């Protein structure tokens, strides 16, 4: 099934546009995930020259079936399940006393590669907020990402929200409210309740002159314990 495409190293694509108040922006990212550890790493190149958001505003727009589901829970996997004719993917993102990113995705299989193609919108960023002064630290923290069945569309229903370091200390938050629906016209997995744990470290490639992101990225399925 779904699941089966993702026993191995799979390569990825990342192509996103976007317009932050206005700030137009494309972001292409490569690399390769192997579910079967969780694992994903892509590099991120601001196509357009300087990026005009800090980079970890990005990370969870710029493909969540590369989380490992671990053997007990593995019909709660959606993401694959709906391989490969893929997923819609689709948020608003709400920076806590700042502005929203709106945000849709297709996620699916191009031949060998798994394709994450995204528009982004912003608005109502402040000029004195944390965002568009680049006040946040260039680090990532660790969350939960709370995931239900929403069976009226056949799909999931996806809320969480991330902890970004400002360089005086404080904590900005975005709260991600997501939705996900099959693009395929196949039965899909449809979960219980359940959440994933993920973690990730930003780093650069030292010898790129380019606006740039190194994402690495750990993300294990879990569930109440029993």
């Known amino acids: 099934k779904g699941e089966e495409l993702f026993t191995g190293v799979v390569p990825i694509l990342v192509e996103l546009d976007g317009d932050v108040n206005g700030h137009k922006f494309s972001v292409s990212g490569e690399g390769e995930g192997d579910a079967t550890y969780g694992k994903l790493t892509l590099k991120f190149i601001c196509?357009?020259?300087?990026?005009?958001?800090?980079?970890?505003?990005?990370?969870?727009?710029?493909?969540?079936?590369?989380?490992?589901?671990?053997?007990?829970?593995?019909?709660?996997?959606?993401?694959?399940?709906?391989?490969?004719?893929?997923?819609?993917?689709?948020?608003?993102?709400?920076?806590?006393?700042?502005?929203?990113?709106?945000?849709?995705?297709?996620?699916?299989?191009?031949?060998?590669?798994?394709?994450?193609?995204?528009?982004?919108?912003?608005?109502d960023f402040k000029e004195d907020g944390n965002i568009l002064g680049h006040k946040l630290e260039y680090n990532y923290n660790s969350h939960n990402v709370y995931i239900m069945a929403d069976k009226q569309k056949n799909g999931i229903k996806?809320?969480?929200?991330?902890?970004?370091?400002?360089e005086d200390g404080?904590?900005?938050?975005?709260?991600?409210?997501?939705?996900n629906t099959p693009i395929g016209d196949g039965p899909v997995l449809l979960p219980d309740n359940?959440?994933?744990?993920?973690?990730?470290?930003?780093?650069?490639?030292?010898?790129?002159?380019?606006?740039?992101?190194?994402?690495?990225?750990?993300?294990?399925?879990?569930?109440i314990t029993h």
């Open 47 to 123: 196509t357009t020259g300087k990026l005009p958001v800090p980079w970890p505003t990005l990370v969870t727009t710029l493909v969540q079936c590369f989380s490992r589901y671990p053997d007990h829970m593995k019909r709660h996997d959606f993401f694959k399940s709906a391989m490969p004719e893929g997923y819609v993917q689709e948020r608003t993102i709400f920076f806590k006393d700042d502005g929203n990113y709106k945000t849709r995705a297709e996620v699916k299989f191009e031949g060998d590669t798994l394709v994450n193609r995204i528009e982004l919108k912003g608005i």
């Open 158 to 166: 996806v809320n969480f929200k991330t902890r970004h370091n400002i």
């Open 170 to 179: 404080s904590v900005q938050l975005a709260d991600h409210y997501q939705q």
């Open 194 to 223: 359940h959440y994933l744990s993920t973690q990730s470290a930003l780093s650069k490639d030292p010898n790129e002159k380019r606006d740039h992101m190194v994402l690495l990225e750990f993300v294990t399925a879990a569930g």
